[PDB]
Amino acid sequence: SVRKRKMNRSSVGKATRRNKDKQRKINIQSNPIIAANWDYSLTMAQNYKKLGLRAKLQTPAGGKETEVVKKLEELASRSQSEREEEWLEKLYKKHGDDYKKMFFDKKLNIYQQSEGDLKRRLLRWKKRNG
Amino acid sequence: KVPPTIAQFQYTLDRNTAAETFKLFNKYRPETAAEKKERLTKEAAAVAEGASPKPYAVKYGLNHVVALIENKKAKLVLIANDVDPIELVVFLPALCKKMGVPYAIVKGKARLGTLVNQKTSAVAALTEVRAEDEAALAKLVSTIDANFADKYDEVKKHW
Amino acid sequence: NNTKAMKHALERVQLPWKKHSFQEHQSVTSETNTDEHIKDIYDDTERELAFYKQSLDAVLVARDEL
Amino acid sequence: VKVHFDQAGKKVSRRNARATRAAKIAPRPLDLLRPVVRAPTVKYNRKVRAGRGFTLAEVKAAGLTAAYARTIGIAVDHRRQNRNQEIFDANVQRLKEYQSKIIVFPRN
Amino acid sequence: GAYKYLEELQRKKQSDVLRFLQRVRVWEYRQKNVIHRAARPTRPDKARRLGYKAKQGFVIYRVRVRRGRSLRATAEERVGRRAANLRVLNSYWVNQDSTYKYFEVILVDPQHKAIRRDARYNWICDPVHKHREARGLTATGKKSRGINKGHKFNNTKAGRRKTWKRQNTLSLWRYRK
Amino acid sequence: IDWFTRHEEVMPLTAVPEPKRRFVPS
Amino acid sequence: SYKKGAASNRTKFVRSLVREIAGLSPYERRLIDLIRNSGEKRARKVAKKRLGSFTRAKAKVEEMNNIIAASRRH
Amino acid sequence: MNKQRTLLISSRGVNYRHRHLIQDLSGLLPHSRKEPKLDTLQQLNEIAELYNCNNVLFFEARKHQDLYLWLSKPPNGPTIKFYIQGSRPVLSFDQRFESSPHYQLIKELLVHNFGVPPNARKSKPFIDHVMSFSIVDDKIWVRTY
RNA sequence: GUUUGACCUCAAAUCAGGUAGGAGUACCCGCUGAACUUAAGCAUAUCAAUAAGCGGAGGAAAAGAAACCAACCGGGAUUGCCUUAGUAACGGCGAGUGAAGCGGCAAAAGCUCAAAUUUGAAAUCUGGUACCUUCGGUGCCCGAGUUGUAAUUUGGAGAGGG
RNA sequence: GUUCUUUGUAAAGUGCCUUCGAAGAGUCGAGUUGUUUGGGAAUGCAGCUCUAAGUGGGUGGUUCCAUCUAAAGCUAA
RNA sequence: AUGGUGAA
């Protein structure tokens, strides 16, 4: 070759890259419980059977719980705004619990929300307050 | 030679009626970018520390106006004659005549732009109005229908 | 496939050619040529010759009437 | 004249590709849960094969939603139709069994 | 809105209204250059349904081509050479003469920051779309390449040279078949 | 001849409901 | 085709509105006169030659019949 | 008396071999009417109403290798389906055509349809060729020399 | 107002910020296109939807989420491999040319517009400039933009409310 | 893993009930002149003439039935 | 034959 002949001849050197070992021994990255329980001497499919978890959901072409309990372990384990709360205080002190009067009201209930909207927000308000 | 739906324009609204139309329309300016921004900072300074009805303005998008006529919500519709693609607005006088919404062809597209905070508008419409200008609006409707529509009933004909 | 409606079709569709001249008809009914007697039906040898004779001898029936 | 000298090479390529996908998609089984489908044409109708994707109907009958189905790794097809009754039953049972097996981790 | 009315108005092309617009514009476009920039698309409904937004970065070049290879693709190729920084998106017919045909080809500036942002159009910035018209990757190019789905397009679906090279070169395995 | 438009229109061309966004302040 | 293409009051309105505002094309201008003079028979002949297929020319002449009848009377 | 017209019509999809047959027979028939295109059946009667044609030849096209020709008459014609694998013509025929009504009726059709009326629009006085009609293996064979 | 002012259009500049050319070219995408040679002379078949030439890309390209294939107890984006198969089919049936659906596998991922009004408020973006935690954020000014920029929707429907 | 901040009557999702509900044209197609193929239902494309429809339109199967939704675009392996 | 270089 023309260009390769110069690169071998020059005193610049070549951008030598040794990256063939890393193409096989790939570290697991996305789960810490797996990161501890993964034998790199074994293959992909062999590591899955060792754990318990399925490696393939289809019937595979060709031929052929210590860890899974720890995954079930990690499976065992919103408020309202200041204006919204203060606005609900105005409605409750005015009417009480008359939602029909509350939604036919114009001065306090400006955005013409339904009975179901106002009462739901009042239930959340009655949890944080009286 | 012009096909009758073209040159249904150019037979536009006259001097005095157009002046009176803008006497109405210039009352109903949309709130400009600067004015709107300063109002919301006034709202920010007030409402953060310690009611209003719907404000009337002119409606000015071509899609918005073609919605409003046939809604039907438009009362007066102003239409510019000078449009770069004329075919954009040629159907619009016919649409207004069909739905029975009073329309007027105004002269000058930039003339519509002045009342509306834009460069050009091609179409402008006044959907709703304040109570004081209601009688004045309806009088202008009759004024436009007498001057524009009744004088040029033959505008659908003659090349 | 019934032959009742077939004969009803012979009533309405068919035109009487015998009332008119051979000029108006222009169709030689080359009868007595059954053509089931043709040898080698899959080789196409006698089928060529017997049809060619059926076509050419039909001209001489029309030739006198022309 | 092309020769496939790289038959051994490309199997090692494909295996290492699956190995990377295993490393990156750590607990998940590399491929999506595909349906069970009856093949077309008189010749092959006796054969029952892996289909492309389920359906909105099969997903809805299983007890989950279409957009959510894809996030849990169920392949969903929208152009496929549920004409057969036996195929519909087999796929619904396949999903319900799959839903008993899955363990969807929390987002916290 | 109006785009339904325009859509239907553009159907009746030889009708009185649109006939008159043709004979005025055909004269006007002959006064101007062969390749020149229109400020706004004359058929804006068509511009939209071919992917034009009236924002900074979109350009509508008007182009003139001779009558009697395809003319639509030639129209796009001519503007590609003149406006090299731009990327051809789509083109459409506007007007025609006995001698010439006119197209209003729509372009996008990939260099303009209003396009490098929004995700609906930032795909055109990717270097794989340099001269889409010079490779027949536009609407009319893909049409002339015979690329659709069906029995009709069997010999020219995924590259007519690709299917030829596949069919007329011997393939041999390690363990021979 | 302004033939179709002489018969003047009555209901609007749609039937779409108008949303609550066109009432309570925006 | 569950979503085949229902009537849609708006689309019907727009099509008929444009149908009159545009006017008539030169072949149609000839065609409507050809209906009134030479009958519907010869009208279908010219329309079939002008357009592609006869199935197009049927609905076309039928549309012309609707236009003429509605114009003169109402 | 013999005043008739022929009407060669075709369905979507005709080329090479079949269009050789359509175009050359349209050339050989001086009273032929070459039409653009058709797609389906009931319409064909109204096609005859246009040109006052006394005959019709409809080329239907189905399973990609075969051929399906439909021959019929204008007012109340009984159609017969087929499956085959500009001078004044002379029309030769067969004995086995007259053996049954099945072949006698199609003989009548082949006389005035595929032949010619003497008072044709493009009728030439000089003769050139013959028309061979005969039956072998339940099918017809036609060659023009 | 025989002034003046809106726009639209055409200009301008050694202004500010950019960008396109050329090289390489095995692969890919387009465009253009021979002849020696094969059947007997050569118009097709045949060299050949080749070689040369021209234009354009990338790490791949192209293709792609059906206006698809089918005729079945239906399949379900595309690409590639195995097979279908030297089969259907075409070819002075001859030099011969030569698929495709199905099936097995490789790899798998879907979505964005245009479409009916934000109209109780262009909710959007460019640029300049001032700072900041600078592949950017924020304030302010400017321009674009209603001949429609944002949000909401793409038939798998969807939206309005309850 | 470790924190610092999360807000606004904010942003969705799901089931039921109620009222509506627009999807691309000098394009589809038609005739013809060339190109493309081994393409028999000129396949595909281009040139030129004319040029549609919305209980629509395209493609296939023996009188109906099945199948998709063109004329806009993006996308790894 | 394709493409190029030279030339009373």
Protein architecture, described:
This is part of a larger assembly, with eight protein chains of eight kinds. Chain A is mainly α and 130 residues long. Chain A contains seven helices and no strands. The termini of chain A are far apart. Chain D has 108 residues and is mainly alpha-helical. Chain D has one domain (1-108). Helices cover 44% and strands 8% of the residues of chain D. In chain D, strands 2-3 form a two-stranded antiparallel sheet. In chain D, helix 2 (56-62) packs across helix 4. The longest helix of chain D has 18 residues, at 7-24. Chain D is flat. Chain F has 26 residues and is mostly loops. Helix content of chain H is 23%, strand content 21%. Chain H has three helices and eight strands. Chain H has a four-stranded mixed sheet with strand order 1-2-3-4, with no helix packed on it. Chain A binds chain F through residues 110-113, and chain F through 20, 23-25. Chain E binds three RNA strands through helix 1, helix 3, helix 4, helix 5 and helix 6.
Topology of helices and strands:
This is part of a larger assembly, with eight protein chains of eight kinds.
Chain E: H1 3-9, H2 16-31, E1 35-38, H3 44-48, E2 58-66, H4 71-82, E3 87-90, E4 93-96, E5 100-108, H5 113-117, H6 139-144, H7 160-167, E6 171-173
Antiparallel strand pairs in E: 1-2, 2-5, 3-5, 4-5
Chain F: no helix or strand
Chain G: H1 9-21, H2 26-50, H3 54-73
Helix pairs in contact in G: 2-3
Chain E binds three RNA strands through helix 1, helix 3, helix 4, helix 5 and helix 6.
PDB class: ribosome
Keywords: Large Subunit Biogenesis Nucleolus, ribosome
Entry title: State A architectural model (Nsa1-TAP Flag-Ytm1) - Visualizing the assembly pathway of nucleolar pre-60S ribosomes
Keywords:
part of a larger assembly; 8 chains; F: 26 residues; little secondary structure; 0% helix; rod-shaped; H: 145 residues; alpha/beta; four-stranded mixed β-sheet; two-stranded parallel ribbon; globular; RNA-binding; Ribosome biogenesis protein BRX1 (chain H); Ribosome_biogenesis_Nop16 (chain A)
Q: What's the helix count of chain B?
A: 6
Strand-residue proportion of chain H:
15-25%
**What is the gyration radius of chain H calculated from CA atoms?**
15 Å
Order of helices and strands of chain H: EHHEEEEHEEE
Largest sheet of chain H: 4 strands, mixed
Strand order of the largest sheet of chain B: 2-1-3
- Overall structural class of chain B, as computed from helix and strand content, comes to mainly alpha
- Order of neighbouring strands in the sheet with most strands of chain H: 1-2-3-4
Structural class of chain H: alpha/beta
Indicate the overall shape of chain H: globular
CATH superfamily of chain B: Ribosomal protein L30/S12
Query: Approximately how much helix is present in the residues of chain B?
Result: 25-40%
- Report the span from N to C terminus of chain B: 6 Å
**Count of beta strands of chain H:** 8
Main sheet overview of chain B: 3 strands, mixed
Subunit structure (chain H): Part of a complex that includes BRX1, RPF1, RPF2 and SSF1 or SSF2.
Protein name (chain H): Ribosome biogenesis protein BRX1
Domain Brix (chain H): 4-145
Subcellular location (chain H): Nucleus, Nucleolus
